Design an enzyme around this catalytic site. Sequence first.
Site, PDB file in Angstrom:
ATOM      1  CG  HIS C  75     -26.697  -5.519 -31.779  1.00 61.42           C
ATOM      2  ND1 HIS C  75     -25.437  -5.107 -32.165  1.00 61.42           N
ATOM      3  CD2 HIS C  75     -27.452  -5.519 -32.904  1.00 61.42           C
ATOM      4  CE1 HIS C  75     -25.439  -4.847 -33.460  1.00 61.42           C
ATOM      5  NE2 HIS C  75     -26.647  -5.093 -33.933  1.00 61.42           N
ATOM      6  CD  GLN C  77     -28.564  -1.589 -22.412  1.00 61.00           C
ATOM      7  OE1 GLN C  77     -28.025  -0.800 -21.626  1.00 61.00           O
ATOM      8  NE2 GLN C  77     -28.926  -2.814 -22.058  1.00 61.00           N
ATOM      9  CG  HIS C  79     -27.697  -0.311 -32.939  1.00 60.39           C
ATOM     10  ND1 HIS C  79     -27.403   0.215 -34.179  1.00 60.39           N
ATOM     11  CD2 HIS C  79     -27.626  -1.657 -33.077  1.00 60.39           C
ATOM     12  CE1 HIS C  79     -27.151  -0.767 -35.026  1.00 60.39           C
ATOM     13  NE2 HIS C  79     -27.280  -1.914 -34.381  1.00 60.39           N
TER      14      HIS C  79
END
Lengths: 104, 109, 104
Positions: C75, C77, C79
């Site tokens: 998650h 990464q 973003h």
Amino acid sequence: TTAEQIPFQLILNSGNARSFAMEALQFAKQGKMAEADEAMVKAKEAINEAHHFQTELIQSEARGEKTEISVLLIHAQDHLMNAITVKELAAEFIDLYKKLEAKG
Amino acid sequence: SNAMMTTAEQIPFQLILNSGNARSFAMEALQFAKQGKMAEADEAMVKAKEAINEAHHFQTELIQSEARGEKTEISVLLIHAQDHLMNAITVKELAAEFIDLYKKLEAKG
Amino acid sequence: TTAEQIPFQLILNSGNARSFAMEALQFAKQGKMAEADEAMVKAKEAINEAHHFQTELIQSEARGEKTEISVLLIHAQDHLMNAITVKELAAEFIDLYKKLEAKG
Ligand SMILES: [Cl-]
Ligand SMILES: [Cl-]
Ligand SMILES: [Mg+2]
Ligand code: NA
Ligand code: NA
Ligand code: NA
Ligand code: NA
Ligand code: NA
């Protein structure tokens, strides 16, 4: 193993959201603003559906449940996150087309 | 790793190479269109697509491996590689939209 | 999980960078180019913070130092990858708006 349906449900809903957003962008390009706005409404709905699954996924880990990480799952998370990104910038393309119709 | 790279560990590098080149073609095309170089933009988009196709070949093999029950080793690089592939697809898709917008702006003024 | 603070830190910095970049687009949209440009400096400063986390994640692993893979990390990464792309294309939008200004 119902949790292992998460990737499929993520991909399905995210693809649906992404599709709606691009359809919205094409409508706006053709000057169909009402149709564009509607498609975005629908895109927002689809991303909501997808988020339900992402939330449960994140909370599962938080909760202390073990999740078997696979390529498919990582890929499913990419679908959602890229869908959110497409939708956010599509809104800006739509807004720009509206600006351009204002001037002639 | 730097000490030893396994065969499977080759996939992330290949995905990053091809996806990276896809993203590069898309941005090169965006930049061309911005200069009113529309034919060069159109052609760079074709190359973008081709590069995504090459990256896609590794994707299918990777997913199918799992389907077979061949567990893949999850690493930062593999996750990053997946990010790059999906990113290239997103950038190409939106760059198409920048290009069309630049064509419209030419059509007016 | 002392290294599991890295995902949280990646998410926070990336999310803030993305917000900054979108702020910049909205400013330029209003004709506020100074505010837009300033908003992008902040975006770049925040991207750098998150990017620094990621370079260390990739490099440490290349060294043989394994990171614990979790949903939150994945998650995190996502973003950053999306924040980077939003910043980059927000810059293209800012250019489009500056373009439209200049011609009239
Ligand atoms: Cl959510
Ligand atoms: Cl501020
Ligand atoms: Mg990802
Ligand atoms: Na806009
Ligand atoms: Na091809
Ligand atoms: Na696997
Ligand atoms: Na467009
Ligand atoms: Na631009």
